[PDB]
Design a protein around this ligand. Structure first.
Ligand SMILES: [K+]
Ligand SMILES: [K+]
Ligand SMILES: [K+]
Ligand SMILES: [K+]
Ligand SMILES: [K+]
Ligand SMILES: [K+]
Ligand SMILES: [K+]
Ligand SMILES: [K+]
Ligand SMILES: [K+]
Ligand SMILES: [K+]
Ligand SMILES: [K+]
Ligand SMILES: [K+]
Ligand SMILES: [Mg+2]
Ligand SMILES: [Mg+2]
Ligand SMILES: [Mg+2]
Ligand SMILES: [Mg+2]
Ligand SMILES: [Mg+2]
Ligand SMILES: [Mg+2]
Lengths: 173, 123, 270, 128, 195, 184
RNA sequence: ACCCCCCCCUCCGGCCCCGCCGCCCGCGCCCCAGCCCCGUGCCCCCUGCCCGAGGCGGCCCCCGCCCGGGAGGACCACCC
RNA sequence: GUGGGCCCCUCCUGGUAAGCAGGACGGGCGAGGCGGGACGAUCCGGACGCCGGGCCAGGGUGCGCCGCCGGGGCCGGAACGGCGUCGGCCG
């Protein structure tokens, strides 16, 4: 559901400063209306330009090619009930937006932090040798094999319409 | 049943009226059709003639299937005459063939007060 | 508030309700436990209470203050004329308890047993065991019917009755009771022993022995409707209580707003 | 004592999702929750699924490390692996489940009366 | 309108109760066999204290008015199902009267054809590290007197059914030999097109 | 990791048969059976060696493979050599008495701290108990199953308890002194 | 482990066996494993829609008082 | 006619505090049906002639009891303790 957007903005031009500077950002958001709001949240803190005093020049939407599985490293900050913290996370996904979906669900589940509690500092691709987290690194290898981690899930699902049967089914492994 | 005697059919059940926890709409019946588990596979049984046997007269009551209900294969049906509570848990027949019962399968509000702007002729 | 001084409740709540007994006589509800291999023996008998006396006996104890001295003891006397065994019943242990297989009666049944089947004997028309005696005449039917108890039962009992024409009682009909056969080597040996007792008398010297211990089961003396002082043993109220001192004063607190089953009330005693 | 493993080139049957009912092959392993699958001779686009949807067959296809939808397509067709699955008793049942999914209400009526002829024949046989 | 006969071995108590209750209200007759082999998730001792805390609740002024606490495994299952039924109405009392519960498999059900509900069986429902106990063992700790009798009867029954299977095996090799009745080979091939 | 695993060496003198997490071992001394079917394990018997493995360990499942491998090693020493526990009867002023009975399947104890109660402790089957014929006031427990030998020695220790006294001063009892293998 | 649960012990709807002596109803049996799951990932899916023996499981029915004594008792009941 | 009011949200004063007592903008009950919050004059929605059809707010969707699936994680109450488990930051 996440999407990559590039936003340009600038302070409204005046007599003291004709041709103000242009600032660009990369944003991940579910749509164009949330993305432009998040651009004004940062430009107000980092550059002290409220939304009343500036204008947005573009909301570029960028669609990425998948088809191969890469590593990503996300540097972010979030807020808990006792303060603010920094954190680095690693994930394997096919596009950057999909890697941000995975991050937001792990923050929501293990830290209970929602979307507006989180500021993304950095998102970059990480080559296989340079990985630093054990979970990701296991799969950055040649020849990884494991048996199915939950084959019971197949059997139960079929038993939701086939409510009564004549023998208890097996779980092939 | 001397006119539906030889008609093969698909089994069904009358589970209850349409309701909430506060109110109950007796003019629509909820019906369970065997082999229908999805809202999508309710199209096949949509709009077809059904029947239930009132086991005080022994005669059938005829009706039709109108809408689906929920996500899980339930349907809504309207009968010629609204059903009594005694009939819950009983079996419903979904006929595979066609039967011309005239207008004896249609609800009582649609037969009269159905508003055809129509008149009383007086012969 | 808390009851200020400590004192137990009056009477035993495990003998409730205090109603009249509805069983006719004392009924033996349990039997002694069977021991696989033990010598065969009978476990019960039925008598009538005759009287009390006292005896002098020489005490042979050890560590007691009566170690080599004489004591006077009270004894009770029970009248036990011989009983007649008339039938054999078997039961099986099932997931629903004890269920019976069949009951095999004797070929010939006496007058004291036949009278227990009728309300008035002189007036009634006599049709008890009329067909059974005809079929069972030839003894083969008994052997076949005993051919089941050997194959399906875990517990064997004999049916026996008393002879009330050998007592000073008024009744003329017998009292009928099952007596369990314990001991033996297997089930099949306890049915050969029960058959060898059919239509025969049994003396009490062939059940109990001298110095052994027994249990006595009966129905107590009756006193009719009786109040709380005597029925339950509660304390009698002081002399200047307005409406009488043979009562329980408080029969419950305000809450709960009912009378509890643990409170003493008047009714049938004995 | 496992005989079916999650690995590159393992053939799977899709049991849920919008591609339910189809075969496909694994090309990459994101984690213990998800894979990259791509079956191009059966009608599946290269996508990420959850391992909760994939049923492991007993067949592995020999493939390269990072193939492409064209190279995989000719790698698959070289192997006889797909044709042996369809001959097994699982593959035969899948075939019948595709002729009993198109049925219409008139046809439900016809199948139902046939089941009444089979039930009564097998009883007119069991009585010797 | 046949009877649905369910072998309760391996099933979760509450997940099986929910199924039976919904079937009863659809006008179905249901029997349940081997109630002492059903399963309750949790450690046996946690399950034990839970059933001993129910037994402490009785009407203070007269225990004959109070909740009755049944000790056999079949009756525990039947009281769980009544919690999922509007049993104080006529529609609800008709549903209870259509239900039967049995410890073991007794002769009145011994030739019925059985079924299972795998969506409520513990090997598909519970994680491997969760503790679990059998209903029969809980009952024996709160007062059921017949644990040993059900086992003796179950043992004799399976031996007699194990002999039966051997002769049933041979019968199938004669019943199924009947590929010589063409008037059925005309039935199978038409069913072939639609399958 | 995806798998946690340990491996052990199978000695030349035993036979091993593993099937559905039932390990049966047999050499000269005897034959042993254990049942590890209460844990999720992937055991592999192949090429005269044994491996135990757990797929996707999360918490205390990583604690399993070394436990099941250690129990199997005690199942090779017992079937080869056997276990031997030596206890010592200790006392002050009241000699404990000890008679082996039941042809070395039970022991009686008398006169512990001058007491009238007598003590009877039966051996778990497969265990034998003899008085020392070398050094006085000492018992010998022998068997192939290490759990069985240790459970019997602890049941003897638990039978001789001094009640209601300062145990730091009253120290009579029967104490395990040597936990080792046999020596033939 | 004075605790808790069961036995013993008190009451006990219902039920069973035995004495004297007919009705009705239904048609369906492998077992055991889930980190061997032994080759699975099905069958059933028509209770009349055309089904309707024997065996095997169910169901119904079947039994007086008054009167007088008492070891029983307000009246009744209970035991004779 | 009324000149006994009370409650909610924000903001306050006395009091250890109170379902205590006294003030303020706006709203409600009073004098507001219906659904939901198990249950409640005031909370969440929505404010009302008599009907038929459609759409759906608030709250929810194992059975009682109308309605559910797919996916990613984890597995009343204070100071103060925890080599329970999963995840981080600094050396
Ligand atoms: K007081
Ligand atoms: K007092
Ligand atoms: K008193
Ligand atoms: K009271
Ligand atoms: K009372
Ligand atoms: K009292
Ligand atoms: K009184
Ligand atoms: K108690
Ligand atoms: K006692
Ligand atoms: K104050
Ligand atoms: K108002
Ligand atoms: K922690
Ligand atoms: Mg006075
Ligand atoms: Mg006065
Ligand atoms: Mg106030
Ligand atoms: Mg007013
Ligand atoms: Mg309400
Ligand atoms: Mg429902």
């Amino acid at each position: 559901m996440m999407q990559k957007y590039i936003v340009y903005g600038r302070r409204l031009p005046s007599e003291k400063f004709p041709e103000p500077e242009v600032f660009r950002m990369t944003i991940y958001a579910p749509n164009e209306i949330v993305a432009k709001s998040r651009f004004w949240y940062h430009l107000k803190s980092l550059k002290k330009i409220k939304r009343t005093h500036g204008e947005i020049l573009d909301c570029q939407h960028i669609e990425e090619n998948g088809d191969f599985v890469k590593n990503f490293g996300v540097l972010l900050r979030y807020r808990s009930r006792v303060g603010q913290h920094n954190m680095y996370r690693e994930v394997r996904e096919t596009t950057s937006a999909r890697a941000m979906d995975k991050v937001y669900s792990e923050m929501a589940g293990q830290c209970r932090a929602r979307y507006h509690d989180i500021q993304i500092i950095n998102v970059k691709e990480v080559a296989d040798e340079d990985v630093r987290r054990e979970k990701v690194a296991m799969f950055t290898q040649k020849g990884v094999r494991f048996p199915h981690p939950c084959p019971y899930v197949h059997v139960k699902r079929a038993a939701r319409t086939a409510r009564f049967q004549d023998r208890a089914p097996h779980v092939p492994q | 049943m001397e006119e539906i005697k030889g008609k093969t059919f698909l089994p069904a059940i009358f589970v209850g009226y349409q309701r909430s926890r506060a109110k109950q709409r007796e003019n629509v019946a909820l019906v369970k059709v065997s082999g229908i588990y999805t809202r999508a596979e309710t199209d096949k049984v949509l709009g077809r003639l059904i029947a239930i046997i009132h086991s005080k007269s022994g005669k059938p009551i005829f009706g039709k299937i109108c809408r689906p209900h929920g996500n899980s294969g339930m349907v809504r049906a309207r009968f010629y005459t609204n059903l009594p509570g005694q009939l819950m848990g009983h079996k419903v027949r979904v006929f595979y063939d066609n039967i011309d019962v005239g207008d004896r399968a249609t609800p009582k509000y649609e037969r009269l007060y159905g508003n055809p702007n129509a008149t009383v002729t007086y012969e | 508030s808390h009851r200020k001084f400590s004192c137990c409740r009056k009477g035993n709540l495990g003998y409730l309700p205090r109603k009249r007994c509805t069983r006719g006589r004392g009924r033996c509800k349990t039997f002694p436990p069977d021991v696989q291999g033990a010598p065969i023996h009978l476990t019960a008998f039925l008598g009538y209470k005759a009287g009390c006396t006292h005896v002098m006996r020489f005490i042979d104890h050890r560590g007691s203050n009566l170690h080599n001295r004489q004591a006077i003891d009270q004894a009770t006397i029970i009248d036990a004329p011989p009983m007649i065994c008339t039938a054999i019943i078997g039961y099986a242990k099932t997931p629903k308890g004890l269920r019976a297989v069949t009951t095999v009666w004797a070929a010939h049944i006496a007058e004291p047993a036949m009278r227990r089947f009728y309300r008035n004997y002189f007036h009634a028309e006599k049709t008890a065991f009329s067909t059974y005696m005809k079929k069972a005449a030839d003894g083969t039917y008994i052997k076949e019917q005993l051919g089941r108890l050997k194959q399906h039962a875990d517990v064997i009992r004999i049916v026996a009755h008393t002879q009330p024409a050998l007592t000073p009682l008024k009744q003329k009909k017998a009292d009928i009771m099952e007596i369990q056969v314990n001991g033996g080597a297997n089930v099949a040996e306890k049915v050969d022993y029960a058959y060898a007792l059919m239509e025969k008398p049994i003396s009490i010297k062939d059940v109990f022995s001298v110095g052994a211990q027994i249990d006595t089961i009966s129905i107590t003396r009756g006193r009719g409707f009786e109040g709380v002082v005597t029925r339950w043993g509660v304390t009698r109220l002081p002399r200047k209580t307005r409406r009488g001192n043979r009562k329980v004063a408080c029969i419950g607190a305000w809450h709960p707003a009912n009378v509890q089953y643990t409170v003493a009330r008047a009714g049938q005693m004995g | 004592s496992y005989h079916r493993f999650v690995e590159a080139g393992r053939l799977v049957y899709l049991g849920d999702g919008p591609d339910k009912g189809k075969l496909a092959v694994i090309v990459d392993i994101l984690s213990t929750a998800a894979v990259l699958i791509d079956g191009p001779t059966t009608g599946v686009k290269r996508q990420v699924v959850s391992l909760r949807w994939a049923m492991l067959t007993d067949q592995v296809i020999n493939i390269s490390e990072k193939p492409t939808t064209e190279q995989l397509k000719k790698e698959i067709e070289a192997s006889p692996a797909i044709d042996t699955f369809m001959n097994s008793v699982w593959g035969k049942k899948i075939q019948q489940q595709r002729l009993r999914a198109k049925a219409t209400f008139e046809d439900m009526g016809k199948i139902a009366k046939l089941r009444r002829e089979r039930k009564m024949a097998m009883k007119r046989i069991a009585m010797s | 309108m046949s009877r649905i006969v369910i072998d309760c071995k391996g099933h979760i108590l509450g997940r099986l109760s929910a199924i039976v209750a919904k079937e009863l209200l659809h006008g179905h007759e249901v029997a349940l066999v081997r109630c002492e082999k059903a399963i309750i998730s949790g450690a046996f001792r946690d399950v034990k204290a839970h059933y001993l805390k129910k037994m402490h609740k009785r009407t203070n002024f007269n225990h004959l008015r109070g909740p009755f606490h049944f000790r056999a495994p079949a009756e525990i299952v039947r009281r769980t199902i009544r919690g999922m039924i509007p049993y104080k109405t006529v529609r609800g009392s008709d549903a209870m009267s259509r239900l039967r519960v049995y410890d073991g498999i007794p002769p009145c059900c011994a030739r019925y054809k059985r079924v299972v509900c795998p969506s409520a069986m513990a090997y598909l429902c519970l994680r491997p590290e969760r503790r679990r106990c059998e209903v029969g063992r809980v009952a024996h700790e709160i007062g059921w007197q017949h644990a040993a009798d059900v086992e003796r009867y179950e043992k004799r029954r399976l031996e007699e059914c194990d002999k039966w299977y051997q002769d049933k095996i041979q019968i199938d090799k004669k019943i199924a030999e009947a590929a010589e009745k063409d008037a059925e080979l005309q039935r199978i091939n038409a069913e072939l097109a639609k399958y | 990791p995806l798998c946690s695993s340990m491996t052990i060496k199978v000695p030349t003198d035993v036979e091993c048969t593993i099937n559905k997490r039932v390990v049966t071992v047999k050499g000269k001394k005897g034959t042993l059976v254990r049942d590890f079917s209460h844990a999720p394990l992937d055991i592999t018997h192949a090429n005269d060696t044994i491996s135990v493995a757990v797929w996707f360990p999360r918490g205390k499942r990583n604690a399993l493979p070394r436990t099941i491998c250690s129990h199997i090693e005690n199942m090779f020493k017992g079937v080869t050599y056997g276990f031997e526990y030596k206890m010592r009867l200790a006392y002050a002023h009241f000699p404990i008495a000890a008679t082996v009975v039941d042809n070395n399947k039970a022991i009686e104890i008398r006169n512990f701290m001058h007491q009238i109660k007598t003590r009877r402790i039966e051996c778990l089957p497969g265990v034998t108990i003899a008085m020392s014929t070398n050094v006085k006031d000492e018992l010998i427990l022998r068997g192939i199953s290490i759990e069985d030998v240790s459970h019997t020695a602890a049941r003897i220790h638990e039978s001789l308890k001094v009640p209601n006294k300062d145990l730091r001063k009253f120290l009579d009892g029967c104490y395990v002194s040597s936990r080792g293998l046999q020596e033939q």
